[PDB]
Design a protein that fits this description.
Number of domains: 1
Number of strands: 6
Shape: globular
Number of helices: 2
CATH topology: Alpha-Beta Plaits
Oligomer: monomer
Helix content: 10-25%
Strand content: 25-35%
Order of helices and strands: EHEEHEEE
Distance between the termini: 7 Å
Length: 74
């Protein structure tokens, strides 16, 4: 059901941009691509490992005075 390289993030505030995604998901691996839309976010790593990790790393983090959430984007 899950993917090899794709992590779905929660909806970010007015600061919803790739800038934060890179500064956050940066220390994980070579992000093949990134997507930021008002309501939901997505990040595709160039390495399954980097993604599988970021999913268990970013998930449960904090940002914008709110609990972050990331999972394996279908």
């Amino acid at each position: 059901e899950l993917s090899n390289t794709r992590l779905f993030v929660r909806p970010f505030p007015l600061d919803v941009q790739e800038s934060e995604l890179n500064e956050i998901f940066g220390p994980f691996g070579p992000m093949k691509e990134v997507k930021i839309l008002n309501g939901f976010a997505f990040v595709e790593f160039e390495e399954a490992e980097s993604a599988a990790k970021a999913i268990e790393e970013v998930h449960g983090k904090s940002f914008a005075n709110q609990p972050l959430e990331v999972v394996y984007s279908k």
